[PDB]
């Protein structure tokens, strides 16, 4: 099916507690495979997935140089943005960067991404053309002009259409037994009386991968979006995810409710009901 690779950079200043910390993590779909933390005793790129361990010393050294240099550059960037917003040197701030490539089911590039935020708010983003920028405010425009003068977009594009796609395909092959394996959700419905005239019906989805899933409740065939409590998909810790959807129903009307599950691991959407 479709796949993506993403790197997530977080640079956080902390006046009075040393220089800004830089953390980078890499993912292929919902599987993390690498990490770098400038606060580590001996900062170095480390593997976080079995299939990346086979990469040679050159790979790890290359990664580490990139992250070490980025660590320093983001410290300058944090100083620069503090100034762009006329902020004091007393506060802590964060710059985040999220970038990567999306591939279609045939392995071809669908599109690239390169977005950045400051203190959790969108700051500047590379447009889908991988050639122009969208700045959120007059501060981001300074960065935009600096990046346009340095022809930065061209560098991002070269990477997104080149090495990003090439290495993602390599990872997909080396870790095909997991990365290209969709584990369907194990589903069931639980019943929990709340009072004499109401009961909670909870639809469970466990052990699925990837995280993308659609879990909904229907009453007489009509979606109960407004009356459904849907928790955020959560990691189990074994690579899989979990999720549940619940609805409070009138006692005795349980059979009018159906839970529907959609997941890549499922050839056809599933329909479940409470089974006393």
């Amino acid at each position: 099916g479709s796949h993506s690779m993403r790197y997530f950079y977080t640079a956080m200043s902390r006046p009075g507690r040393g220089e800004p910390r830089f953390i980078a993590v890499g993912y292929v779909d919902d599987t993390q495979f690498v990490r770098f933390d400038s606060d580590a005793a001996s900062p170095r790129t480390e593997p976080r997935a079995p299939w990346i361990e086979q990469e040679g010393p050159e790979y790890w050294d290359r990664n580490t140089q990139i992250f070490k240099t980025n660590t320093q550059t983001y410290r300058e960037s944090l100083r620069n943005l503090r100034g762009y917003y006329n902020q004091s040197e007393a506060g802590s701030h964060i710059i985040q960067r999220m970038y990567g490539c999306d591939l279609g089911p045939d392995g071809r590039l669908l599109r690239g991404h390169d977005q950045s935020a400051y203190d959790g708010k969108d700051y500047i983003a590379l447009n889908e053309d991988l050639s122009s920028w969208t700045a959120a405010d007059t501060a981001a425009q300074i960065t935009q002009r600096k990046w346009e003068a340095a022809r930065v977009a061209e560098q991002r594009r070269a990477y997104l259409e080149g090495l990003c796609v090439e290495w993602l395909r390599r990872y997909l092959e080396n870790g095909k037994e997991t990365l290209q394996r969709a584990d369907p959700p194990k589903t069931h419905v639980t019943h929990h009386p709340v009072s004499d005239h109401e009961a909670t019906l909870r639809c469970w989805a466990l052990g699925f991968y990837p995280a993308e899933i659609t879990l909904t409740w229907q009453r007489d065939g009509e979606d109960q979006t407004q009356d459904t409590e849907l928790v955020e998909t959560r990691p189990a810790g074994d690579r899989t995810f979990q999720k549940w959807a619940a609805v409070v129903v009138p006692s005795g009307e349980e059979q009018r409710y159906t839970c529907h599950v959609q997941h890549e691991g499922l050839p056809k959407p599933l329909t479940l009901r409470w089974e006393p």
Binding site: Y7, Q65, I66, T73, E76, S77
Partner: peptide, 13 residues
Amino acid sequence: LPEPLPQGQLTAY
């Protein structure tokens, strides 16, 4: 693989 360093100076924000 993350974005490699450019030939010149990595451009800060």
